[PDB]
């Protein structure tokens, strides 16, 4: 398969710089949405479920005040979150459909996805069976294989970012701490729990924090929780350095390895950062049955299928109060949003 | 266990990024 992923990377690399270095803008109008219900809301705005009235699409989209924005001084995250997002193309990772701005704020509608937030799901489960994990891990590999070819470090690898649509399949959101970069950066991001050491420590860092990333995730699929937590961030960060880990008695033992492996402090022997790259991981034993083809293509049976009542049904979400979208007379940071 | 102390550390719920 070498040979086929190495050339489904080389076309992959061209479409999305074409994109990259000529992004599209402003394809779609507020109007053109029927407004339904918020699917989720936060610090990072609100995503609400919309319906294209015409088309009866349904769609997520996300809408930020460019104000806020600005107080929270994330022009450039906002501005490059949108940028990629138009110019990327993966199975499991969320499709943005239009984009649009007006004089108070900007608007990314992105595909819909049903099937509710991993994060609620494992939590009302408490653990997925170590197939069940796999199968998600996978995903996300196959995703991380994709973004590192493009020089993209996604930097928010955790279950609240992820979605299960239709066909139980991962779709990866939120793309405001990525960043395109060859080399190391240093910006401190991401979510606590899941933070590389290196993230923490002062030095710079790599595409190797995405791996380690995937780390914490495999774990907390498969105990319920995170390897490392506290009541602060403080005291998690102090337990991510240590770097010691302890698993639960129910891991098998190449699970273990695996994690061992992906967990590891010295980012020079981490699998991911080594000389084979991301085939360390896709040849570790524990993926042993997994059908890498096969998983990119979808036909692959999931082991957890969503329940759905539509299109447009809301009720793998939670509950939000209905705020008003209000769009000034005026026009807001119009030339700190110029690109968006 | 490891799992009570997870359940009592306020942090079960949904982590937002650093800011
Ligand atoms: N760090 C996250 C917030 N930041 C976002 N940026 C883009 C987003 C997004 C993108 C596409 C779609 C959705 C949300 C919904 C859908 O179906 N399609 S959420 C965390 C978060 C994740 C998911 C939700 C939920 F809204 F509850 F699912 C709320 C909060």
Redesign the interface.
């Known amino acids: 398969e070498q040979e086929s992923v190495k050339e489904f990377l080389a076309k992959a690399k061209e479409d999305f710089l074409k994109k990259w270095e000529s992004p599209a803008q402003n394809t779609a109008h507020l109007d053109q949405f029927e407004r339904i219900k918020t699917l989720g809301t ?3 705005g609100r995503v609400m479920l919309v319906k294209h009235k015409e088309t009866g699409n349904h769609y997520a989209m996300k809408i930020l005040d460019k104000q806020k924005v600005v107080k ?1 001084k994330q022009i450039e995250h906002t501005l490059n979150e949108k940028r990629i997002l138009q110019a990327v193309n993966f199975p499991f990772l969320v499709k943005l459909e239009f984009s649009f701005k007006d004089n108070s704020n900007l608007y990314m509608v992105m595909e819909y996805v049903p099937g509710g937030e991993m ?1 609620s799901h494992l ?1 009302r489960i408490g653990r997925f069976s170590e197939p069940h994990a796999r199968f998600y891990a996978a995903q996300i590999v196959l995703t991380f294989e994709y973004l590192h070819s493009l020089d993209l470090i996604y930097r ?1 690898l ?1 279950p ?1 970012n992820l979605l299960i649509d239709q066909q139980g399949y991962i779709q990866v959101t939120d793309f ?2 990525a960043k395109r970069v060859k080399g190391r950066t240093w910006t ?6 899941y933070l590389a050491p290196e993230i923490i420590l002062s030095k710079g860092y790599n595409k190797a924090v995405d791996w380690w990333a995937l780390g914490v995730l495999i774990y907390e699929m498969a105990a ?2 995170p390897p490392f ?3 602060q ?1 403080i005291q998690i960060y102090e337990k991510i350095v240590s770097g010691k880990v ?1 698993f ?1 008695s129910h891991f098998s033992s190449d699970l273990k390895d695996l994690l061992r492996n992906l967990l590891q402090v010295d980012l020079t022997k981490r699998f991911g950062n080594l000389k084979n790259g991301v085939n360390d991981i896709k040849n570790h034993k524990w993926f042993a049955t997994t059908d890498w083809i096969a998983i990119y293509q979808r036909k692959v049976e999931a082991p957890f299928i969503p329940k759905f009542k539509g299109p447009g049904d809301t009720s793998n979400f939670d509950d939000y109060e209905e705020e008003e979208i209000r769009v000034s007379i005026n026009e807001k940071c119009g030339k700190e949003f110029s690109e968006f | 266990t490891t799992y009570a102390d997870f359940i009592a550390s306020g942090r079960t719920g949904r982590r937002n990024a650093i800011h």
Request: net charge negative; proline share 12%.
């Open positions: 936060g610090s990072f929270l994060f939590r928010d955790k609240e405001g701490f401190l991001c991401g979510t606590p729990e319920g929780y937590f506290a009541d961030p302890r639960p």
